[PDB]
Amino acid sequence: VNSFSGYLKLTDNVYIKNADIVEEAKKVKPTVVVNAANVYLKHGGGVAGALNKATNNAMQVESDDYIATNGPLKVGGSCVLSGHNLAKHCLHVVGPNVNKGEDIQLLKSAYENFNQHEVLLAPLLSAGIFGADPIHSLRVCVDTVRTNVYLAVFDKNLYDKLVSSFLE
């Protein structure tokens, strides 16, 4: 039903909230939740682990079936699969892992995938275990995404830093 509440409006199409993306998905029942995926859709840690656990591993079983027949994604690419109990659809998006030396320039390609969907619940791509600067990821989101994006950031200190930096 896409009933988003409690978000700051950063721009005409980008919103942010200090919240667990899993709890937001259960409250909002969005058309699309974004997963911060890797190319073989191994949902072990960070956002991907939280989402998969909240589906009681249904996301991992579906992802394994997709990989078996289609092979891995490319960095910057995406894949629509079922959203299980969290959303109608899950958009699995692969941002660059800069900790593994992947090219940060592909973060724009990663966010471009959002433009195929009118409204998304999403995390900050490539932040967290992927090692990108969270402020940079928010700027690439704001500069690249034209559709309505509701960002959920769990950590209060990171959220307050992001909002402070954006509002300079």
Q: Which residues bind ligand AMP (CB under 6 A)?
A: 20-22, 36, 46-48, 50, 123-124, 127-130, 134, 152-155, 158
| Pairing outcome for strands 8-9 and 14-18 | antiparallel
33 token code pair: 């939740």
Q: Other C-beta atoms within 10 Å of 102: how many?
A: 20
For the bound state, the minimum distance from the C-beta of residue 97 to ligand AMP, rounded and expressed in Å, comes to 9
For the bound state, the minimum distance from the C-beta of residue 46 to ligand AMP, rounded and expressed in Å, comes to 3
For ligand AMP, the closer CB: 80 or 135: 135
For the bound state, the minimum distance from the C-beta of residue 66 to ligand AMP, rounded and expressed in Å, comes to 19
Least Cα distance to 97 among 129, 71, 140 occurs for: 129
Residues 77 and 109 sit within 8 Å (Cβ to Cβ): yes
